[PDB]
Structures are given as structure tokens and as C-alpha cells.
UniProtKB/Swiss-Prot annotation, chain A:
One GO molecular-function entry: RNA binding
Gene name per UniProt: RPL24A
Native organism taxonomy: Eukaryota, Fungi, Dikarya, Ascomycota, Saccharomycotina
Residues with PTM Phosphoserine: 7
Keywords: Cytoplasm, Phosphoprotein, Ribonucleoprotein, Ribosomal protein
Region named Disordered: 66-126
Note: Present with 247000 molecules/cell in log phase SD medium.
Protein name: Large ribosomal subunit protein eL24A
Included range, full protein: 1 to 126 of 155
Assembly and interaction partners: Component of the large ribosomal subunit (LSU). Mature yeast ribosomes consist of a small (40S) and a large (60S) subunit. The 40S small subunit contains 1 molecule of ribosomal RNA (18S rRNA) and 33 different proteins (encoded by 57 genes). The large 60S subunit contains 3 rRNA molecules (25S, 5.8S and 5S rRNA) and 46 different proteins (encoded by 81 genes).
The organism of origin for this protein: Saccharomyces cerevisiae (strain ATCC 204508 / S288c) (Baker's yeast)
Keyword check for Ribonucleoprotein: yes
Protein task: Component of the ribosome, a large ribonucleoprotein complex responsible for the synthesis of proteins in the cell. The small ribosomal subunit (SSU) binds messenger RNAs (mRNAs) and translates the encoded message by selecting cognate aminoacyl-transfer RNA (tRNA) molecules. The large subunit (LSU) contains the ribosomal catalytic site termed the peptidyl transferase center (PTC), which catalyzes the formation of peptide bonds, thereby polymerizing the amino acids delivered by tRNAs into a polypeptide chain.
Source taxon at top rank: Eukaryota
Swiss-Prot record, chain B:
Any Gene Ontology CC annotation: small-subunit processome
Protein name (record): Small ribosomal subunit protein eS6A
Cellular compartments annotated: Cytoplasm; Nucleus, Nucleolus
Gene label: RPS6A
Purpose of the protein: Component of the ribosome, a large ribonucleoprotein complex responsible for the synthesis of proteins in the cell. The small ribosomal subunit (SSU) binds messenger RNAs (mRNAs) and translates the encoded message by selecting cognate aminoacyl-transfer RNA (tRNA) molecules. The large subunit (LSU) contains the ribosomal catalytic site termed the peptidyl transferase center (PTC), which catalyzes the formation of peptide bonds, thereby polymerizing the amino acids delivered by tRNAs into a polypeptide chain.
Coiled coil residues, start to end: none
Amino acid sequence: MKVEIDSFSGAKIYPGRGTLFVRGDSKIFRFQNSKSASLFKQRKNPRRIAWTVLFRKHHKKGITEEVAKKRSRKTVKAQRPITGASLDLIKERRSLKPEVRKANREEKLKANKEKKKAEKAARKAE
Amino acid sequence: MKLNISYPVNGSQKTFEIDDEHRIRVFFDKRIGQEVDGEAVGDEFKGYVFKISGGNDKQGFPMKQGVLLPTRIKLLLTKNVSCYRPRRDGERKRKSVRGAIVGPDLAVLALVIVKKGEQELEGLTDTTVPKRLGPKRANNIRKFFGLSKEDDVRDFVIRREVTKGEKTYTK
RNA sequence: UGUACAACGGGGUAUUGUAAGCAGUAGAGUAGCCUUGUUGUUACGAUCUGCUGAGAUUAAGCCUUUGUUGUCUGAUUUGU
RNA sequence: AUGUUACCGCAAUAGUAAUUGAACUUAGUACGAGAGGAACAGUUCAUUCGGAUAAUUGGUUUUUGCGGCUGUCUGAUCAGGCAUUGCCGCGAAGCUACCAUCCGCUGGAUUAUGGCUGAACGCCUCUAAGUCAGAAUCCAUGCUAGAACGCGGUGAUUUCU
RNA sequence: GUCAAGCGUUCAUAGCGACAUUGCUUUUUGAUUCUUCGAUGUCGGCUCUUCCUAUCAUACCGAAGCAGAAUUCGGUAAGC
RNA sequence: AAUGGAUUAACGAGAUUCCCACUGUCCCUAUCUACUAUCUAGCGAAACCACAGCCAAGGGAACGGGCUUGGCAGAAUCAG
RNA sequence: AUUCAUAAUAACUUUUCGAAUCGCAUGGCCUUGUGCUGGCGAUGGUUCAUUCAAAUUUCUGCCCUAUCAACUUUCGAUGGUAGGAUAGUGGCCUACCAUGGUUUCAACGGGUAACGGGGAAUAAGGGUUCGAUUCCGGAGAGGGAGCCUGAGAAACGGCUACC
RNA sequence: GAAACUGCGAAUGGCUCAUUAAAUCAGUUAUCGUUUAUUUGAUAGUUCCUUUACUACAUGGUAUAACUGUGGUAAUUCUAGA
């Protein structure tokens, strides 16, 4: 079995207890009680009716539901390899990064290479 | 019922055909993002805790976030939203869904684990699927490894070896 | 003269729909104040909001009471 | 009124009640050249009638219980009176509804009819003697009242009267 | 009800049954005028019970010009 | 056919038909209220009255409370 | 012909544009550095103009009907002021105000086997008739309404609803 | 080099003539009253905003698809979950 919710009061409708209504547009309403039913037929607004759950929740009364959204104070904690880099050697080369004389000497080599490049290019142009 | 559970760090996933109707009555009347007890559903899941991610009910209509009901509804959905892909730019569309409350109407419930309990799970925790792709961007690789601003991502590159015939290559 | 009874009180359950009183930098606004504000202040002003799912009623043919206060020998008749 | 009073009972006699249909299945079978087209058992439901009951729903509302509304009176407010129960909305309890729900028994003797053996009438025949099954019938089971002149069992039966 | 010329393809009787005839009933309508004219309140409907059966249906059966279905005739039956 | 004929707007507590609405007229009844009835105190009539007050059949002035044969028959009584 | 183009003062902006893009080719200076500079392109990009458009707009012109003579304005009809909206003028819409506006020189209403035109048949001339129909402009996507995306649709071989 | 993201275009074409009788339409004017993608011609020394450490400019951050797989409906160019 199941329990349901009055359209008007928003109340548990234990089985059998209460009425049901089926408008021509196929909207199925349920009513715990003829009170709610009669108000509905009067075309009242539960948000204006005071004892109703809609008014309750629209005026923010009994607000023990929500508390807050949690936040984690840390990082993802994965400086992992990219599946083709061998993380051990990856960290080894990351540590070799400081004391950058290796890359500096490669730059100096390609630098004298650019020197000789302009030189030999001018030579060929001559 | 079925529990399509996932462990996102291991990247693993498995369906579990559940009974113990009352140990899923616990799951009844539950929203998305909420976390209930593995032990409460199953001592095989003792100590674990999941998070109700969502699920498909009968007629395959998924659970959508934010609507706050168990019953099905027809929403005039639009782009940038679950449960509808547009086959044209500008197309809004009316589709039927089920909402963000849990009940017997559901058939498959999609769960994600946030904590690993005391025991181990056969198809989730004992296994771990790898990262199918490596980062294709320079700085993403560089920060993923923690190298420097200048540590030559070009040579820290990923190389994924595959053989066409006997000729093999990393592409 | 008692796991006694009764009248009140209390609690519960139900019904109704948020009491009076106070306050408000709420309030259509209209008049008057001046140190003419930046809530300016003052008189009046439905109604609104908070205290308030508050208050009221609740066996009279509802339930229950570790409570209180009381009551508990008047008449008549009867024989194998 | 039966010796008194109280309790438990019997049960004479009288009354009596349950009724009909549909659907599925049997079965598109039987049967029928074809056309068409059954039935018993079984199941679920309903019609009519009855006897109760008020959990649910509906109705009713002097709970004159809560709130509100008009006019007027109580200096104003608060709170109230009058308006042949002033009016409206809700409204418990109680009553109540095929407008709601629940329930509505099985054994015997029999008719008609068909028969068993069987003569008269050396055969034959349901009949004459005997005898079987058989109906919404009849009587019992059951149900209602209990003879106020029908009965039984049991308990206690008055003192310084 | 009796009888049965005939109808019923053929056959009087499955079913009907002319011409003739014996009975029953008092729900008609007459006939009569016994009671009633110093008054028996006068049609129908509504309501409500009870009774008869010459049974419309329902229960069980028999017969058929009853293959089945449907139908017709007839019996116990006025329980419903 | 001024023993007036044929129409005739308007009017009618006139007679009649139909439609809309409406409805406890009805399916199908239920519930509520005041006044009664009811019980009491007190007051206190009337109509009517051969004698009185149980049925069946019979016959009989042809539909008896009485007679005949049967059935039955148990003080006094209240509300309806 | 302008309060035009355009320029400057003073501020406004929740902040607009001012290349983190891509293919080829690789060229030159030496201060010998991966220093500095360099080409042919594609893509996109603020403004202005242009072009294909688009929307509004001036004058003239439409078939038969008076067995349709008064029509329009409640709640826009005519104008004006202010404002809103528009991409833009403007009753397009609102607030307020004056009460006007069209009409026998046929208003308005009805009908149309009416979309209009360029044109077709037919003829001495004049003309009468037809012209949905290959080209031009309009309207529509089953009737209606609405709207997203977009430069551009009130899109329908796109969405939403009702019928 | 499929699929997919992205950018374009899908508002043209084509069909019919229902609508519509100062309305469309035809000629004829204007926009000194407006939008205009696209093409085409020209066109962004001035962007450090307590403008001194507030900030990489041999250049910065974020997914997310496709895909991996779990999959759910009888069905949908249905879609969620990781």
C-alpha cells in the first residue's frame, strides 16, 4: 500500500480515508476531508489559508528541513601520471627542473645554432 | 528492483538486483543527493554509504532534479538540462519525466559511493577502470604532474602503444 | 469506607482557524510640525506582519487521571 | 397469583426466506451437409428481498463548538444582546443511506416422471403386495418469541422482629 | 371436455380441429327485486396485506412434424 | 353572422400544451428545531350507549357479537 | 533644406571592440641569444560606406450591389500634448484633453464559381471576355493563437497548447 | 579519417490560390523615419585600472561531448547514472 498527499492541505491519505476528484482535464485531486473538498469547490487558495502546509512553507515556519551545503577543505590529492609518462620518472624530471642548466644549455646550443643559421643563410644568399 | 551503483574513483559500476522489500522501503521517500546506509540496505554493503544519484522508473523515464515529487510530470525542457537532448538549436520540448522522490514506481536506482565501508565489493572496489584518456592540453598535463612552468610537457607527453599488424606505434 | 463513587482541575484525542494585548524603519494616503529629513517627527488611517497551527470549545451518551474537594444506614414489604 | 427472592436452562406451540440472471470456462466443442450452434460440473459477479452495523464516504447540525457578515443597542475598544435557531463556511458526536458496508445453513421423506423384481393374464407389464432415485414441494436442521394457568436445575432464605 | 369431417407433403389426433354436444365459473352484461330508502359514504388511482390457479417466468419431468439452438403441447407445482 | 360572425395588440389570482431554469414531487428516504401528544399537580366536558363486546363454517330477511357445531378460553392494564 | 556629416568640453556603462585562432613556407641582423626580426594566406573582428535584401511610405487606379443611407467613437473612432514600445515614424499603446472624422463625386454593409499584375482569345477602329495556372509581387502549410533560436521566420518537411 | 563538439545553412527552392474588393497589386515617391548576416572597399599605438608588484603574455582557467562502460522502457532521432 501507499499513502498520499491532499492537494489542499498536503496531508497523508491513508487508504480509503478521504475522497478523490477527477476533473474533466484528467487532473486527479485527493482530499483527506470534506473541509478541504468544500474549500476546493469554493476555489480558495491554500497559500492564503493559514493552517495549510503551503502557507506554512510560504511563510517559512517549521524550517528544520534544510541546514547547509558541506565543503571539503583539501585538494583532489592526485599528482598522478597521464598513463604514458611513468610517474616515478615524471617526478624525477620535475625535481631535475630546478637547476635548469640542462635546458639552458640546450637553449644555448640552439642559440649558437640560430647564430650559424643566419650566418649560413646570408652565405647562401650571397 | 535494481541498484546501478558506482564507485567514481575506481570508475567502476555494477547493477545489483535487490529484494528485501523493506530494506528498500528504507530507500522509499528519498531525494537526490541524499546519503543512506549500506548496512541498512544490506549487510553485504555493511559500513558503506551511498548517495542517491537518480534513476529510471518503468517506461524508462528518468528521475529529474529539483522538482521535488515522486509523480511524473510533463516539462517544457530546454538545453543545458538533464533528460533532453535537442535535435535543433532553439528547440524547447515537452517531455515526460519522474521527479526527485524515491518510491516503488522506480525500477533502477542510480547510486554513487562517497565512503568505502569495512568490507570489499566484488565489481566496484576490487576493480578499478583506468583513465581512458590522458590530458590533451599542455598546462593540464603540467599541473597534473606538478612539474613547473617550463618542464617540457612535449617530452612528458603520453604515448599509447598499439599494433596495426606487427608495426607498433604510440599515435 | 474502597485497584468505591461523584463534582472540579490536569493530560490526551478531536473541531476551528492563528485570540485579546503589545510592538512594528509595514501600510493606500490626507492634513499639521520644524533644525525640511533621507525611518524626520505628529494626528487619523481599513488592513498586514511577529509573539500565534495561536486562542477558544472538548461528553453533555469521547478516553484517561499517582491531583484537589466532598459523599457513603432514609423509607416500605416479604415466609416452605 | 402460585412459599419468597435471584440466577441458569429446557422448549410445547406459533412464525419462517432467501430469489433470479449474467459473464468466463466446458466450447465455437457436441449436434448439424452446411447454416449456425448447446449442456452438467467449476469460478467470479450482479437483480430482487431480508437482517444487522456506522470503520470509511455522503447527508443532517441548537455542540447555537470555532470563525466571519449585515443592521441596531450597550460612550468607543474588549466582549456581548436583539433579529420567531438572524445569515454564511467549517463542523465533531449521535442518527442515517442499496447514496455506505457486512451476512443471508444443510439433511430426510415425497409428488409428477422414469424405473427394479414381479404376478393376475403359465407370456408381458413400474403395481396389484414389495421397492429405487427423484423438485423452487413437505418436514426437520437453523433462525425469531417462549406457554404470562408448561416444566426443570441451582443459590440464599430474616430472631432478640 | 366428448366425437372426429378435414388441414398438417403422404397420415384424423405431434399440433389444430369446423359441423354437433356435455359441463364448469361468477372476474363481465343481463334477468330478478329477497335485504337496505328514520342513509351500509358512490369510479379510479395511491398505499398495503392476504388468498385462488384456469402457471407468464423460475425448479423437476413427459410428448413433438424436437438433429442442435429456438419453439409448441402437457403434468406435479401458487414456493418465489 | 348584433339568437352577432372572423380576427384582435394589451390585460387576466381564467382553461390548456410545450421548452429553459429550479427543485425532497419523485428514485428513497434520512436528519434537526419549537409546540404537542407522553408522565405529573390542579381543573375537567362531549358525542355515543337494547345488552354487551374472541374467530371459522352453517343456515337464517340470502354478509352474526349472540343461535347451531367446532376452534378456543386465565385478573387488572398503558401507549398507539 | 537639418539639431546633417564631423569635432570638443563633463560625466555616465551592470562595460562594448582593441586577435591567447589556424595552414604553408621557412627568410634575414648580428648585440652568437631557441635573441631579434620576416613572407603568402584562411578564420574572425569595432565603425562607416557598398551590394543582395527587408519593413514602412506619397499620387493614381479595382468587379456587382441602394431589396444596404447614414457610418465611426461604449472598451480609439479624428486630432493634439507627455510618456511608453518599436530597429525605427506614428493611436502602435496608454494618461489627459478638444469633439470630431467619411458620406449621392455611392461612405458603410452584403456578394464574388475574386489573389492581383505581366498577359491570353478575339476583332477595321472602338471594344468585350478571360487571366488559379511556367515570370513579378502577395497569402498559407489541417484551423487558430503563441514563441524559441537566429542577421533574417511568427518557420510549420521547428517547437507549446486548444479544436 | 567514421562518429562527435564547433561554424554555417536549414527563412531560398517547390506546392496551392483558401484568404483578401482601397486590401493585395501595377506604375510612381520618400526613409531629413529604420534593421541589414553575408560579400566587396576602407577601419581598433591609447586594454597594467592605489594605473609599484595589485597581473604568465616565448600565453592563462573550465568543463563537456564523442568514447569507456552500468544501463532503464513494449514502443520514441526516448535518455539517466559513473
